[PDB]
Amino acid sequence: TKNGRDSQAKRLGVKRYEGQVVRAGNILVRQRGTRFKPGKNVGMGRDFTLFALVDGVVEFQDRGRLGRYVHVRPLA
Amino acid sequence: RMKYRKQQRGRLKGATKGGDYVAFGDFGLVALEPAWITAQQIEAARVAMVRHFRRGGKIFIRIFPDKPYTKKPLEVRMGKGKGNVEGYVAVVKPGRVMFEVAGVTEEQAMEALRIAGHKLPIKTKIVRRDAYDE
Amino acid sequence: DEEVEVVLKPEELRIDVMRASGPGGQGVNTTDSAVRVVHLPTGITVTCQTTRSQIKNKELALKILKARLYELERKK
RNA sequence: UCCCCCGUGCCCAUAGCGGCGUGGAACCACCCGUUCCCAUUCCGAACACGGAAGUGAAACGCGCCAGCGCCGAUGGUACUGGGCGGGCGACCGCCUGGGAGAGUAGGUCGGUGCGGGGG
RNA sequence: UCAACGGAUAAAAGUUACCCCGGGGAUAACAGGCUGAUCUCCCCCGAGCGUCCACAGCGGCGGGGAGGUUUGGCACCUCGAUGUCGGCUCGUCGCAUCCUGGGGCUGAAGAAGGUCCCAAGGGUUGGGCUGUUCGCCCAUUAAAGCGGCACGCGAGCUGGGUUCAGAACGUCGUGAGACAGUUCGGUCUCUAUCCGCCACGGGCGCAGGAGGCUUGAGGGGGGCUCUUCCUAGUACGAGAG
RNA sequence: UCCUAAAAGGUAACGGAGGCGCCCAAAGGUCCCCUCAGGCGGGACGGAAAUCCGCCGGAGAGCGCAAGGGUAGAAGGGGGC
RNA sequence: UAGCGAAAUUCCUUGUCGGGUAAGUUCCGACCUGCACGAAAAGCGUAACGACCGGAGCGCUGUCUCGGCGAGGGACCCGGUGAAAUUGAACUGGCCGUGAAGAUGCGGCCUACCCGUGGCAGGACGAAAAGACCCCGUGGAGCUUUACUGCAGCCUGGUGU
RNA sequence: CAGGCUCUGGCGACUGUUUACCAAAAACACAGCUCUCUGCGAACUCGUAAGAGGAGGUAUAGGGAGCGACGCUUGCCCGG
RNA sequence: UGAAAAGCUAACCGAGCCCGGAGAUAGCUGGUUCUCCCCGAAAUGACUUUAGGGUCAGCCUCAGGCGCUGACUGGGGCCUGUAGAGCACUGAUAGGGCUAGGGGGCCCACCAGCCUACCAAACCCUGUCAAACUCCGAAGGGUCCCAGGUGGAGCCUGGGAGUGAGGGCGCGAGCGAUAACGUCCGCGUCCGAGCGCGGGAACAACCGAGACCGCCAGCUAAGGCCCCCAAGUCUGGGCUAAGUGGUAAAGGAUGUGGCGCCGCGAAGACAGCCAGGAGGUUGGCUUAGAAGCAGCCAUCCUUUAAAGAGUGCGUAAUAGCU
RNA sequence: CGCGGGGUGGAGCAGCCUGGUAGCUCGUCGGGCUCAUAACCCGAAGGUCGUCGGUUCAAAUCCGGCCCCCGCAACCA
RNA sequence: AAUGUAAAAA
RNA sequence: CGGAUUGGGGUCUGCAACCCGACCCCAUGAAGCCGGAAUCGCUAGUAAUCGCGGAUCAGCCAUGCCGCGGUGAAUACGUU
RNA sequence: UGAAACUCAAAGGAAUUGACGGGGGCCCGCACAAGCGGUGGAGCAUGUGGUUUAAUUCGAAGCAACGCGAAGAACCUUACC
Ligand SMILES: [Mg+2]
Ligand SMILES: [Mg+2]
Ligand SMILES: [Mg+2]
Ligand SMILES: [Mg+2]
Ligand SMILES: [Mg+2]
Ligand SMILES: [Mg+2]
Ligand SMILES: [Mg+2]
Ligand SMILES: [Mg+2]
Ligand SMILES: [Mg+2]
Ligand SMILES: [Mg+2]
Ligand SMILES: [Mg+2]
Ligand SMILES: [Mg+2]
Ligand SMILES: [Mg+2]
Ligand SMILES: [Mg+2]
Ligand SMILES: [Mg+2]
Ligand SMILES: [Mg+2]
Ligand SMILES: [Mg+2]
Ligand SMILES: [Mg+2]
Ligand SMILES: [Mg+2]
Ligand SMILES: [Mg+2]
Ligand SMILES: [Mg+2]
Ligand SMILES: [Mg+2]
Ligand SMILES: [Mg+2]
Ligand SMILES: [Mg+2]
Ligand SMILES: [Mg+2]
Ligand SMILES: [Mg+2]
Ligand SMILES: [Mg+2]
Ligand SMILES: [Mg+2]
Ligand SMILES: [Mg+2]
Ligand SMILES: [Mg+2]
Ligand SMILES: [Mg+2]
Ligand SMILES: [Mg+2]
Ligand SMILES: [Mg+2]
Ligand SMILES: [Mg+2]
Ligand SMILES: [Mg+2]
Ligand SMILES: [Mg+2]
Ligand SMILES: [Mg+2]
Ligand SMILES: [Mg+2]
Ligand SMILES: [Mg+2]
Ligand SMILES: [Mg+2]
Ligand SMILES: [Mg+2]
Ligand SMILES: [Mg+2]
Ligand SMILES: [Mg+2]
Ligand SMILES: [Mg+2]
Ligand SMILES: [Mg+2]
Ligand SMILES: [Mg+2]
Ligand SMILES: [Mg+2]
Ligand SMILES: [Mg+2]
Ligand SMILES: [Mg+2]
Ligand SMILES: [Mg+2]
Ligand SMILES: [Mg+2]
Ligand SMILES: [Mg+2]
Ligand SMILES: [Mg+2]
Ligand SMILES: [Mg+2]
Ligand SMILES: [Mg+2]
Ligand SMILES: [Mg+2]
Ligand SMILES: [Mg+2]
Ligand SMILES: [Mg+2]
Ligand SMILES: [Mg+2]
Ligand SMILES: [Mg+2]
Ligand SMILES: [Mg+2]
Ligand SMILES: [Mg+2]
Ligand SMILES: [Mg+2]
Ligand SMILES: [Mg+2]
Ligand SMILES: [Mg+2]
Ligand SMILES: [Mg+2]
Ligand SMILES: [Mg+2]
Ligand SMILES: [Mg+2]
Ligand SMILES: [Mg+2]
Ligand SMILES: [Mg+2]
Ligand SMILES: [Mg+2]
Ligand SMILES: [Mg+2]
Ligand SMILES: [Mg+2]
Ligand SMILES: [Mg+2]
Ligand SMILES: [Mg+2]
Ligand SMILES: [Mg+2]
Ligand SMILES: [Mg+2]
Ligand SMILES: [Mg+2]
Ligand SMILES: [Mg+2]
Ligand SMILES: [Mg+2]
Ligand SMILES: [Mg+2]
Ligand SMILES: [Mg+2]
Ligand SMILES: [Mg+2]
Ligand SMILES: [Mg+2]
Ligand SMILES: [Mg+2]
Ligand SMILES: [Mg+2]
Ligand SMILES: [Mg+2]
Ligand SMILES: [Mg+2]
Ligand SMILES: [Mg+2]
Ligand SMILES: [Mg+2]
Ligand SMILES: [Mg+2]
Ligand SMILES: [Mg+2]
Ligand SMILES: [Mg+2]
Ligand SMILES: [Mg+2]
Ligand SMILES: [Mg+2]
Ligand SMILES: [Mg+2]
Ligand SMILES: [Mg+2]
Ligand SMILES: [Mg+2]
Ligand SMILES: [Mg+2]
Ligand SMILES: [Mg+2]
Ligand SMILES: [Mg+2]
Ligand SMILES: [Mg+2]
Ligand SMILES: [Mg+2]
Ligand SMILES: [Mg+2]
Ligand SMILES: [Mg+2]
Ligand SMILES: [Mg+2]
Ligand SMILES: [Mg+2]
Ligand SMILES: [Mg+2]
Ligand SMILES: [Mg+2]
Ligand SMILES: [Mg+2]
Ligand SMILES: [Mg+2]
Ligand SMILES: [Mg+2]
Ligand SMILES: [Mg+2]
Ligand SMILES: [Mg+2]
Ligand SMILES: [Mg+2]
Ligand SMILES: [Mg+2]
Ligand SMILES: [Mg+2]
Ligand SMILES: [Mg+2]
Ligand SMILES: [Mg+2]
Ligand SMILES: [Mg+2]
Ligand SMILES: [Mg+2]
Ligand SMILES: [Mg+2]
Ligand SMILES: [Mg+2]
Ligand SMILES: [Mg+2]
Ligand SMILES: [Mg+2]
Ligand SMILES: [Mg+2]
Ligand SMILES: [Mg+2]
Ligand SMILES: [Mg+2]
Ligand SMILES: [Mg+2]
Ligand SMILES: [Mg+2]
Ligand SMILES: [Mg+2]
Ligand SMILES: [Mg+2]
Ligand SMILES: [Mg+2]
Ligand SMILES: [Mg+2]
Ligand SMILES: [Mg+2]
Ligand SMILES: [Mg+2]
Ligand SMILES: [Mg+2]
Ligand SMILES: [Mg+2]
Ligand SMILES: [Mg+2]
Ligand SMILES: [Mg+2]
Ligand SMILES: [Mg+2]
Ligand SMILES: [Mg+2]
Ligand SMILES: [Mg+2]
Ligand SMILES: [Mg+2]
Ligand SMILES: [Mg+2]
Ligand SMILES: [Mg+2]
Ligand SMILES: [Mg+2]
Ligand SMILES: [Mg+2]
Ligand SMILES: [Mg+2]
Ligand SMILES: [Mg+2]
Ligand SMILES: [Mg+2]
Ligand SMILES: [Mg+2]
Ligand SMILES: [Mg+2]
Ligand SMILES: [Mg+2]
Ligand SMILES: [Mg+2]
Ligand SMILES: [Mg+2]
Ligand SMILES: [Mg+2]
Ligand SMILES: [Mg+2]
Ligand SMILES: [Mg+2]
Ligand SMILES: [Mg+2]
Ligand SMILES: [Mg+2]
Ligand SMILES: [Mg+2]
Ligand SMILES: [Mg+2]
Ligand SMILES: [Mg+2]
Ligand SMILES: [Mg+2]
Ligand SMILES: [Mg+2]
Ligand SMILES: [Mg+2]
Ligand SMILES: [Mg+2]
Ligand SMILES: [Mg+2]
Ligand SMILES: [Mg+2]
Ligand SMILES: [Mg+2]
Ligand SMILES: [Mg+2]
Ligand SMILES: [Mg+2]
Ligand SMILES: [Mg+2]
Ligand SMILES: [Mg+2]
Ligand SMILES: [Mg+2]
Ligand SMILES: [Mg+2]
Ligand SMILES: [Mg+2]
Ligand SMILES: [Mg+2]
Ligand SMILES: [Mg+2]
Ligand SMILES: [Mg+2]
Ligand SMILES: [Mg+2]
Ligand SMILES: [Mg+2]
Ligand SMILES: [Mg+2]
Ligand SMILES: [Mg+2]
Ligand SMILES: [Mg+2]
Ligand SMILES: [Mg+2]
Ligand SMILES: [Mg+2]
Ligand SMILES: [Mg+2]
Ligand SMILES: [Mg+2]
Ligand SMILES: [Mg+2]
Ligand SMILES: [Mg+2]
Ligand SMILES: [Mg+2]
Ligand SMILES: [Mg+2]
Ligand SMILES: [Mg+2]
Ligand SMILES: [Mg+2]
Ligand SMILES: [Mg+2]
Ligand SMILES: [Mg+2]
Ligand SMILES: [Mg+2]
Ligand SMILES: [Mg+2]
Ligand SMILES: [Mg+2]
Ligand SMILES: [Mg+2]
Ligand SMILES: [Mg+2]
Ligand SMILES: [Mg+2]
Ligand SMILES: [Mg+2]
Ligand SMILES: [Mg+2]
Ligand SMILES: [Mg+2]
Ligand SMILES: [Mg+2]
Ligand SMILES: [Mg+2]
Ligand SMILES: [Mg+2]
Ligand SMILES: [Mg+2]
Ligand SMILES: [Mg+2]
Ligand SMILES: [Mg+2]
Ligand SMILES: [Mg+2]
Ligand SMILES: [Mg+2]
Ligand SMILES: [Mg+2]
Ligand SMILES: [Mg+2]
Ligand SMILES: [Mg+2]
Ligand SMILES: [Mg+2]
Ligand SMILES: [Mg+2]
Ligand SMILES: [Mg+2]
Ligand SMILES: [Mg+2]
Ligand SMILES: [Mg+2]
Ligand SMILES: [Mg+2]
Ligand SMILES: [Mg+2]
Ligand SMILES: [Mg+2]
Ligand SMILES: [Mg+2]
Ligand SMILES: [Mg+2]
Ligand SMILES: [Mg+2]
Ligand SMILES: [Mg+2]
Ligand SMILES: [Mg+2]
Ligand SMILES: [Mg+2]
Ligand SMILES: [Mg+2]
Ligand SMILES: [Mg+2]
Ligand SMILES: [Mg+2]
Ligand SMILES: [Mg+2]
Ligand SMILES: [Mg+2]
Ligand SMILES: [Mg+2]
Ligand SMILES: [Mg+2]
Ligand SMILES: [Mg+2]
Ligand SMILES: [Mg+2]
Ligand SMILES: [Mg+2]
Ligand SMILES: [Mg+2]
Ligand SMILES: [Mg+2]
Ligand SMILES: [Mg+2]
Ligand SMILES: [Mg+2]
Ligand SMILES: [Mg+2]
Ligand SMILES: [Mg+2]
Ligand SMILES: [Mg+2]
Ligand SMILES: [Mg+2]
Ligand SMILES: [Mg+2]
Ligand SMILES: [Mg+2]
C-alpha cells in the first residue's frame, strides 16, 4: 500500500533570537521563502537564509503590510 | 459529496462546540452524550418521524455525516482499512441539536421526536424553544 | 417483474460449520472451516470446504446457492 | 510661534472604498507644440524636450459623511501549566495561576518627523 | 537503475517429504489467556402483517447487551516436547429445557397444537452411508436437547483420517521437486514414587479393664416413562373427534 | 513535498496523500520598461474561451515540472547589451 | 482425432439417472460443462495369475446385542537371590480467587488422627528425547538447471615427432 | 496332520524383485515393440598410462533410451 | 554393488571406519569459584546482506585540569501555529431567498412566451463540518541576558565499561473496532536494578515510602479502628430496605426521600358514588359495508347547569356499556 | 484478500508504448446481374472508445478510483 | 459457376 | 452555356382556375463541365437530327400518342 | 447362413411421344461481333412501388405491368372520401 514515503526533516527556523550577541556573519534565520526580510547589516543568500554582516545584537521588527524584518544593531 | 479519502479518528473531548440551540421549528432533539452517529442511524430516525405523522409538517436535520468510517475485512495489519463499511458519520457531542420538527402539535413532536430517540445510540432530550435566542 | 434477492433472507436458510476434510495437518483437525448452506424452503443445498477460511467459504457457498436457487425460480 | 501648498520618511486601514463640497495668487496637474535631446513591438497614450495661451474638467491637496471595509472593550464562558477526586468506559468534576475566538458596547473617514516655497 | 541507492566479488539461480547442527516460546501451527469484530442467545423502539386489532402469533429502519460453543485478532506461560480428528470406555457439570412434572396467555369448544414463565430429578433407542465431526436417510420413541470440562478422556484403548521415508493419477515447474487435490502402504513405550480415587489392614487414641447390643450428627444410593381398561362414548362438538 | 508531529528542533507504524533520477545559451548576469487572474459592457469573422476598447478588479494569475513557503514596493511579462 | 471419461485423473460433488439395500458420501451401469483423460512418461481392451486395493451375497461364528463359566502361565502370600529409568530438597489435601495469564507450596475458605497392602490411571503442565513442525544463523549437507566460475571429456587451428 | 465358497470393479499380463530393522505394492524386473550409436585397434565403460572389459564377439552383433505378455491402434504441429 | 529403496557396503550410510589438519569455525546455548567499601547504567539515534551481531553518538565510572557555570527558579526580551474557536482562503454542508442551465405540461411553429407543491451552477441570509482548511489564537514550550542556586551539580582532556529485546501506569495522537495484559511515537513516571518495608485479601510497576547496623522507645504516611486483626460498636445531621453496599447497558416503573413551577378547592375540589350523557348527525368522502367509532377531509348550532362533528370496547353494519 | 492482462460502429479484431487524424473483415442500407433468391459487382451509412474524476491548450491514447471479462496464485503446519 | 417447398389434368 | 426555382404584374377558356389550367412580360437566374456497376435502339433514305399536322378536347398540365415531310451517316472480318 | 415388427400402393422392365442437356451436326433473327447515337448522373415532365391521408377509387406485374385502360381528372369526368 504505497504511502510509506517522506523526506528527511530540514530543521529550519530562527537560529538566533532577539537580544543575542552575534559574530561576524553567523546565520540568524533559515526560512522557506521570505517569512522574514533583511535589514541593517543583514543580507540573505540563495535559500533565503539570513545572516549577520557585522557583530552586535539581533533585533526583530514587524512592519505590517511591509513584512517582518531582522537586523543587527552593532557596537564596538 | 467530495472531500478527500479516509480521515483519522480523533477524540471527542468535552461537548464545547458539541451543541447549539433550536434554529428552526417548534421543537427539537438534543444529544446528552458524545458519539459518532452513522448515516443509517440518521435516516432511521428521519423516516421514522415521517412515518409517524403521514403527510406531515417539516423535519429539519441540523447534523450531517462527513467523517469516513474505516474498517478491516476480517484480516490483520497491512495498510489502513479500506473503510467506509458503515460509510459515514457525524460527530455529535453533548448539547448538539440534531432534528427540528415544525408544523405539528406537541403530542406529535413529543411522540415522533421520542421515537427517533430510540434509533439513536445516545441518551437524548426534546426541547420546546424556551426563548433564549441572540 | 422479478424476485431474486428476497430469498437470501437469513431466516430461510441454515448454515452449518464443521471440520474440513483431507489435508491441513493439525490445522484441518482442530479448525472447522467446512461450510454448508442449506436452503430450507427448497431443501437445495451447497457445501464448500476449498479455502482455509470459514468466512471465505460461507461467502462462496452463499454465492453459489444464490445462482442455483435463482435458476430454479427462473425456471418456475 | 501660526497657516497654505511642495518634496521626503515614519506608525502601516481608526489611514481604505464610495458620497458631497472645495482651491489655481504661489505650488501641482492638465494644456500648446514635437524643431532639437529622446521615445512607441503602432500611437509624443507613455517616457522625453521646448513652451505662452487656456483650465481646476481629470489627477491631486483639503474637508464633511459611516453605507461597505478596517479597528473593537467589558463581563462571561472554552481551553489550559501546576495540584486533587470520579465513571467499565466514551468521559466528567474541584483547587491554584494563566485565559481566548466569536458576538456585544463602542471607535474610524487618520497621526506624525524632517526639509523647501508661499502670507 | 553499485536503484537492496553508506555501494560485500571483477564475476552467481532453484530444490529437499532423504535431510542434518546450533538456537528461539525473542516467532507460526495445538491448547490456555486477553479481546469478542464473527458466532450463539436475549433485549429497547415499534413502520407494518395478522378481516377489526402494533406482542394470540409476528416485526422493516435503527439501537443496547449477555455468553465465551465457532471463525478471527494479539503473541503472554509452554519449542532441554503441553501428542493432534474421529470412534471406544468411563463419565461429570451448565441450563439458554428435547421428554416427563407445574403454570399465564391463545386467533384454547373438545382432542391436538402455538407461545412465554417455573422447573435438572431422572430419562434422552437401533441401523444404512462416510475416517469422519456434521449431515441425509430407514424403523421406532415420552423424547430421540444443546453445551462446559486442554472442542473432557491415547502413563486407558483404537489408529480409519491427519503429519515422515515408498508408489501412482491429475497438476505446476526445463529441472530437482511441488499441491488444506486425489490414491494404495506404512513400528502408539511390561514395573505408579507423590496427589487423587477404589478397596483392605497395622498403630495409637476415645483420662478404670472387659463381652454384647444400639443412637444417628454427617454422608452416600435412588429418583425415568409409556399403553390399554373403567369412569364415558359422559362434559364438549353440526359432525368427524 | 504535506500531514500525522502534541505552536522551538526532533520524533514511529506494511499511518494518510503526491512527486524526483530532469530541464533552460536562454528558462542565465545586468540596465531600462512593464503588471495578472478573473467579472460586467461594447465589438466584423470568432465565439463559453482567439484579437480589440471601456470600466471594476491586491493578488484567487504567473513563477519549466509535485507540493509547500514566498511573492506584482517582483521572484512575474518585454527589450538592449 | 480414435478411443475413454465424476476415473488410482471431478473443485462445485453425496453432480443427475438407473442397480443393489429397510435405508448406499462407498460400490456397480449410464450420460459428459473432462476445474485439470488422450494415444510407447503409450490409448483403449484382455483369458489367466495376485498373502495388491474396492463393492456385494451364501456359509459360519463370542466381531457384536452382552456377557457368563472354566483351564493352565503370571499377578497375591512364604522361603532364597535381587535390578531400572527417575530424583533441587519435602513435613507433597479440596474449592474459589490468585499469580508469567492451567497452584500441594500465595489469599481466603472447606476437609483431614499416624503408617502401610492390594488395585485405578485424573493431576504432579508425569519419564524418555537440549521439538523432527515453524522461524532465526550472512550453520551444514544431498539434488537440479538455459544461476556464477572452474575441471574431465570431446571438437579445433598452429606447430614438434 | 487337513481349502470357507460365489458374484462384480480397479492396477499390474504372467513365475520373479525390493526399502536387512515401521512400506512387498499398482513400485523395479520380465519376454516383447520402437528409436539411436557402432565397420572393428567398434561404439561405449574403468584406468594418468600400460592396459582391460566389450569379445577371442563382428550389424540376425554390441552399447544407450523409452515403452513393457497378447489384441486393436498410436492423429496433427518442426516457430523455440 | 544395486530386478532401483538413495537400498547395502561390519547393529544409525543423501556418501563407511580409523587417524591426522584439530584447540576448524560457532555474530548460538551453557558455565565462570573468597570478603568488604564508594558510585552506578541501557534497552534510544545514525549507518549496517543490518535486525537476538556490530561502529559512532547518548547514558555509567575512575584520574588529572577548570572554578559558580548545573539542574530547578525570579525578571525581561525575541521565535511558535497546537487546545480552543473561526469560515476570510481550499473543500464539505442542511433549509430558505434569489437566479443561469436542465426536466415536464398549456401554447407553437417564424422563433417566442407563460406556468412549474421538479434538478440545479453562481450569488445572498439561516445553520454547520474539516489531520493534510485558517481572518484568529491561548495555557505552555524553546533560546539569549541578568540574578538565586556549592550540588555524588556543571565544563575540559584522558583510562575503563556495560547497553543497543524493554515493561506497566497517567496524559497527548496514529494504527485497531472510541477491542486486546494489542500495537507505534511523544512527555512523564515506577518495575527493570527497589519480587526490600506498610496499604490494596493474595499480586514487578495502583496509593504510602527510598532498608548502613542495633533497641521488648517514640510521631506519623497510605490505609484503617465489629470479631479473625492494632486501634471508636466515637459524636452530630441526613439517605438507603436492595444484602443495594459486595462492583453491566439501552430502555423501563403510583420504590422512597428532598427542592421547584403550574393549575383545582370551604362560592365545596381529587376519589368513589346516584341521574342525563341528547337533537339535524346516520358529519362530508370512499368502501360490498364504513351509523362518534377501517382508511381520507375536516373546526356547526340547538334543549341545557350538561353531553366532544368524538375515548375505548363491541356488531356484518347497530344498539349497547363507557 | 494478491498479482497480470482487457472493456473500441450490430459481431470479432486493430489504434494506445511514442496524446492532434478511430482503421480491417463480416454484417447493415441503396442500386445492379437473375425468372427469382445466394454468390458476384457499384455506392453509402454506423462508433458516448465501461462509468466517475484528474493532467494537458488538447485524452480512446497519460494518471487515480469504482464496475464487468479473462490468466495466475491462495503454501508449512 | 448453388438452390427454388407445400392443392391444377371428364 | 443551361433555363430550374422564386417574386411581381397581366391576358384567355370556362358558372369557377386556393387546392389544380395554359400563356405573356419583367426580375430572379438552380443542379448540371457528358454521368458507377449496369443497359436500350438502329443495317439505308435507316440512326441521328429538324420542324408540320391530326385524333381527343371549353381550356389543358402533350415532353404523350398516331401520322408527315426536310437535311442525312457509320459499319457488318465472322458465327467461337 | 439370414429373419421380424413396422410401413408404402406401389416398386419395376422394355418401348413411345415430348421437354430439357454446362451433347452433337446443319441453319437463322440488330442475337453477338463491327458501328452510330443513347438511358443509368443533373433539372423537369410522366407512369409505378412505398409511406402518408378523412379519402389519396380500381385494374395492369419479368420478357408480353410501369407516357399501359385514360385519344385530354379544376366542378363534368369519377368508380374514392
Ligand atoms: Mg513513514
Ligand atoms: Mg518533511
Ligand atoms: Mg521520518
Ligand atoms: Mg515531515
Ligand atoms: Mg460504530
Ligand atoms: Mg496471521
Ligand atoms: Mg407554527
Ligand atoms: Mg405549536
Ligand atoms: Mg435508542
Ligand atoms: Mg438511546
Ligand atoms: Mg429522553
Ligand atoms: Mg443563544
Ligand atoms: Mg429477514
Ligand atoms: Mg480424507
Ligand atoms: Mg498431501
Ligand atoms: Mg503437504
Ligand atoms: Mg484454530
Ligand atoms: Mg477452534
Ligand atoms: Mg480443502
Ligand atoms: Mg484453495
Ligand atoms: Mg414452487
Ligand atoms: Mg518664533
Ligand atoms: Mg523658535
Ligand atoms: Mg523616521
Ligand atoms: Mg483657475
Ligand atoms: Mg489644438
Ligand atoms: Mg514628426
Ligand atoms: Mg519647425
Ligand atoms: Mg541639436
Ligand atoms: Mg533645445
Ligand atoms: Mg531615453
Ligand atoms: Mg518604433
Ligand atoms: Mg526646443
Ligand atoms: Mg478656478
Ligand atoms: Mg477636481
Ligand atoms: Mg481626492
Ligand atoms: Mg471583537
Ligand atoms: Mg474578555
Ligand atoms: Mg486547571
Ligand atoms: Mg491540569
Ligand atoms: Mg489543588
Ligand atoms: Mg476507575
Ligand atoms: Mg475577543
Ligand atoms: Mg458578526
Ligand atoms: Mg473612513
Ligand atoms: Mg477618503
Ligand atoms: Mg516646516
Ligand atoms: Mg544494502
Ligand atoms: Mg546488489
Ligand atoms: Mg525445502
Ligand atoms: Mg517427495
Ligand atoms: Mg514420496
Ligand atoms: Mg525418493
Ligand atoms: Mg543428509
Ligand atoms: Mg535440531
Ligand atoms: Mg510468545
Ligand atoms: Mg458480548
Ligand atoms: Mg450477533
Ligand atoms: Mg438481554
Ligand atoms: Mg419504532
Ligand atoms: Mg405507538
Ligand atoms: Mg391491516
Ligand atoms: Mg420497511
Ligand atoms: Mg431485518
Ligand atoms: Mg447495532
Ligand atoms: Mg450492538
Ligand atoms: Mg509485543
Ligand atoms: Mg523439562
Ligand atoms: Mg514431559
Ligand atoms: Mg414441560
Ligand atoms: Mg386443550
Ligand atoms: Mg477418504
Ligand atoms: Mg440415533
Ligand atoms: Mg477450541
Ligand atoms: Mg474452547
Ligand atoms: Mg479432544
Ligand atoms: Mg497411544
Ligand atoms: Mg487419539
Ligand atoms: Mg481420542
Ligand atoms: Mg496399522
Ligand atoms: Mg482410508
Ligand atoms: Mg494412516
Ligand atoms: Mg524418513
Ligand atoms: Mg511438463
Ligand atoms: Mg487446491
Ligand atoms: Mg489411504
Ligand atoms: Mg499391507
Ligand atoms: Mg506383560
Ligand atoms: Mg500400570
Ligand atoms: Mg501389628
Ligand atoms: Mg485401624
Ligand atoms: Mg442423616
Ligand atoms: Mg443422590
Ligand atoms: Mg367408551
Ligand atoms: Mg359420539
Ligand atoms: Mg363402552
Ligand atoms: Mg353435549
Ligand atoms: Mg361425518
Ligand atoms: Mg370416535
Ligand atoms: Mg514539513
Ligand atoms: Mg513541530
Ligand atoms: Mg508541520
Ligand atoms: Mg503540550
Ligand atoms: Mg512540543
Ligand atoms: Mg492533534
Ligand atoms: Mg511546528
Ligand atoms: Mg493515519
Ligand atoms: Mg544519470
Ligand atoms: Mg537570449
Ligand atoms: Mg459594465
Ligand atoms: Mg457582437
Ligand atoms: Mg471569442
Ligand atoms: Mg464577445
Ligand atoms: Mg498573496
Ligand atoms: Mg509546513
Ligand atoms: Mg506555490
Ligand atoms: Mg502557494
Ligand atoms: Mg524581472
Ligand atoms: Mg473425441
Ligand atoms: Mg458418482
Ligand atoms: Mg482406472
Ligand atoms: Mg450420491
Ligand atoms: Mg436406489
Ligand atoms: Mg468449476
Ligand atoms: Mg486435455
Ligand atoms: Mg508421449
Ligand atoms: Mg501403461
Ligand atoms: Mg482385466
Ligand atoms: Mg501380491
Ligand atoms: Mg507373487
Ligand atoms: Mg454357495
Ligand atoms: Mg454372511
Ligand atoms: Mg487361573
Ligand atoms: Mg492369591
Ligand atoms: Mg509381590
Ligand atoms: Mg496423604
Ligand atoms: Mg501434593
Ligand atoms: Mg504471602
Ligand atoms: Mg498403594
Ligand atoms: Mg509385598
Ligand atoms: Mg495418574
Ligand atoms: Mg505431587
Ligand atoms: Mg498425563
Ligand atoms: Mg532446541
Ligand atoms: Mg547471504
Ligand atoms: Mg553444499
Ligand atoms: Mg545456451
Ligand atoms: Mg540450450
Ligand atoms: Mg573452459
Ligand atoms: Mg590441439
Ligand atoms: Mg591439433
Ligand atoms: Mg488331511
Ligand atoms: Mg487342502
Ligand atoms: Mg462351499
Ligand atoms: Mg505383478
Ligand atoms: Mg495393460
Ligand atoms: Mg515359483
Ligand atoms: Mg537381488
Ligand atoms: Mg524384505
Ligand atoms: Mg536400520
Ligand atoms: Mg531403514
Ligand atoms: Mg508379495
Ligand atoms: Mg522396487
Ligand atoms: Mg529387452
Ligand atoms: Mg508388443
Ligand atoms: Mg549406422
Ligand atoms: Mg569416467
Ligand atoms: Mg579417461
Ligand atoms: Mg575375449
Ligand atoms: Mg504421438
Ligand atoms: Mg487433428
Ligand atoms: Mg517443432
Ligand atoms: Mg527446421
Ligand atoms: Mg527453423
Ligand atoms: Mg539390501
Ligand atoms: Mg567397524
Ligand atoms: Mg539400529
Ligand atoms: Mg547403506
Ligand atoms: Mg558428505
Ligand atoms: Mg572445539
Ligand atoms: Mg561478532
Ligand atoms: Mg548509591
Ligand atoms: Mg540491533
Ligand atoms: Mg570562585
Ligand atoms: Mg525565565
Ligand atoms: Mg469557508
Ligand atoms: Mg450552501
Ligand atoms: Mg428554464
Ligand atoms: Mg424549461
Ligand atoms: Mg400546461
Ligand atoms: Mg423552467
Ligand atoms: Mg445581496
Ligand atoms: Mg450568511
Ligand atoms: Mg449576514
Ligand atoms: Mg495565521
Ligand atoms: Mg472577523
Ligand atoms: Mg482578532
Ligand atoms: Mg547565575
Ligand atoms: Mg530497539
Ligand atoms: Mg518502548
Ligand atoms: Mg490498551
Ligand atoms: Mg511482595
Ligand atoms: Mg488484584
Ligand atoms: Mg520488582
Ligand atoms: Mg510491588
Ligand atoms: Mg501515637
Ligand atoms: Mg489517617
Ligand atoms: Mg452517625
Ligand atoms: Mg447518622
Ligand atoms: Mg451484591
Ligand atoms: Mg425512567
Ligand atoms: Mg407520575
Ligand atoms: Mg350519542
Ligand atoms: Mg349516515
Ligand atoms: Mg349513536
Ligand atoms: Mg366499526
Ligand atoms: Mg347482540
Ligand atoms: Mg352494512
Ligand atoms: Mg352510540
Ligand atoms: Mg483488445
Ligand atoms: Mg482497465
Ligand atoms: Mg474485455
Ligand atoms: Mg479502446
Ligand atoms: Mg464490441
Ligand atoms: Mg453496442
Ligand atoms: Mg489499453
Ligand atoms: Mg423480386
Ligand atoms: Mg451515387
Ligand atoms: Mg462496398
Ligand atoms: Mg478509456
Ligand atoms: Mg480524439
Ligand atoms: Mg491454483
Ligand atoms: Mg512440514
Ligand atoms: Mg515446503
Ligand atoms: Mg439449400
Ligand atoms: Mg426448401
Ligand atoms: Mg420441387
Ligand atoms: Mg398591368
Ligand atoms: Mg465550359
Ligand atoms: Mg387540343
Ligand atoms: Mg408531338
Ligand atoms: Mg425382434
Ligand atoms: Mg438489339
Ligand atoms: Mg431488321
Ligand atoms: Mg455491339
Ligand atoms: Mg445518361
Ligand atoms: Mg435522371
Ligand atoms: Mg416500377
Ligand atoms: Mg402523418
Ligand atoms: Mg376490379
Ligand atoms: Mg392500384
Ligand atoms: Mg392520359
Curated annotation (Swiss-Prot), chain A:
InterPro entries linked to this entry: Ribosomal_bL27, Ribosomal_bL27_CS
Domain of life, source organism: Bacteria
Q: Which UniProt keywords apply?
A: Ribonucleoprotein, Ribosomal protein
A GO term from the CC aspect:
cytosolic large ribosomal subunit
Q: Give GO BP annotations, semicolon-separated.
A: translation
**GO terms for molecular function, please?**
structural constituent of ribosome
Q: Which family does it belong to?
A: Belongs to the bacterial ribosomal protein bL27 family.
* Name of protein: Large ribosomal subunit protein bL27
Organism of this sequence: Thermus thermophilus (strain ATCC BAA-163 / DSM 7039 / HB27)
Gene field: rpmA
Curated annotation (Swiss-Prot), chain B:
Read off the InterPro entries from this record.
Ribosomal_uL16 (IPR047873), Ribosomal_uL16_bact-type (IPR000114), Ribosomal_uL16_dom (IPR016180), Ribosomal_uL16_sf (IPR036920)
Which GO terms fall under molecular function for this chain's record?
Answer: rRNA binding; structural constituent of ribosome; tRNA binding
- Which keywords accompany this UniProt record? Ribonucleoprotein, Ribosomal protein, RNA-binding, rRNA-binding, tRNA-binding
- Can you name a GO cellular component term? cytosolic large ribosomal subunit
Source domain of life: Bacteria
One GO process term, biological-process aspect: translation
Q: How does it assemble?
A: Part of the 50S ribosomal subunit.
Family per UniProt?
Belongs to the universal ribosomal protein uL16 family.
Report the function annotation for this chain.
Binds 23S rRNA and is also seen to make contacts with the A and possibly P site tRNAs.
Name it: Large ribosomal subunit protein uL16
Source organism: Thermus thermophilus (strain ATCC BAA-163 / DSM 7039 / HB27)
User: Gene symbol?
Assistant: rplP
